[PDB]
Ligand binder design. Structure first.
Ligand SMILES: [Co+2]
Length: 152
């Protein structure tokens, strides 16, 4: 099978350069341990979507503001399957600031691939908001094998 991604979201209080690499790296930190492939399409979204919205987007799944669900992407599949949801009213920040655009992008992208919602406590896959140094920003814990093997 073939895989494809497409990003198109830019929130305030954060340079477009941070978000660009934030998500762009999310595909690497994940693909680092996955049989999947790589296909950066310039035009033509695919099973994997990425868009930021504020609460109820007319016909979407509203979440909340700063504090609640900063971003939660449902499992993969058709259409919605593999869609990213980033709270607009939220407060995005660098790898140091609270809402880690990088780490978050990896957590949301994971749920829209084949991740549960916990795996391990130390792992960065846990359902929580934490900021880690981009220098060491990378997959860890046993989860690293739960993505490459994909069993349960
Ligand atoms: Co989550």
């Amino acid at each position: 099978h073939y895989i494809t991604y497409r990003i198109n979201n830019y929130t305030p209080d954060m340079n477009r350069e941070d978000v660009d690499y934030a998500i762009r790296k999310a595909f690497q930190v994940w693909s680092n341990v996955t049989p999947l492939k790589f296909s950066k399409i310039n035009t033509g979204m695919a099973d994997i979507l990425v868009v930021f919205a504020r609460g109820a987007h007319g016909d979407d799944h509203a979440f909340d503001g700063k504090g609640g669900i900063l971003a939660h992407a449902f499992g993969p599949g058709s259409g919605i399957g593999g869609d990213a949801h980033f709270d607009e009213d939220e407060f995005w920040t660098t790898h140091s600031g609270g809402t880690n655009l990088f780490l978050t992008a990896v957590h949301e992208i994971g749920h829209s691939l084949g991740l549960g919602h916990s795996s391990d406590p130390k792992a960065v896959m846990f359902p929580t908001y934490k900021y880690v140094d981009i220098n060491t920003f990378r997959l860890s814990a046993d989860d690293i094998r739960g993505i490459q093997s994909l069993y349960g």
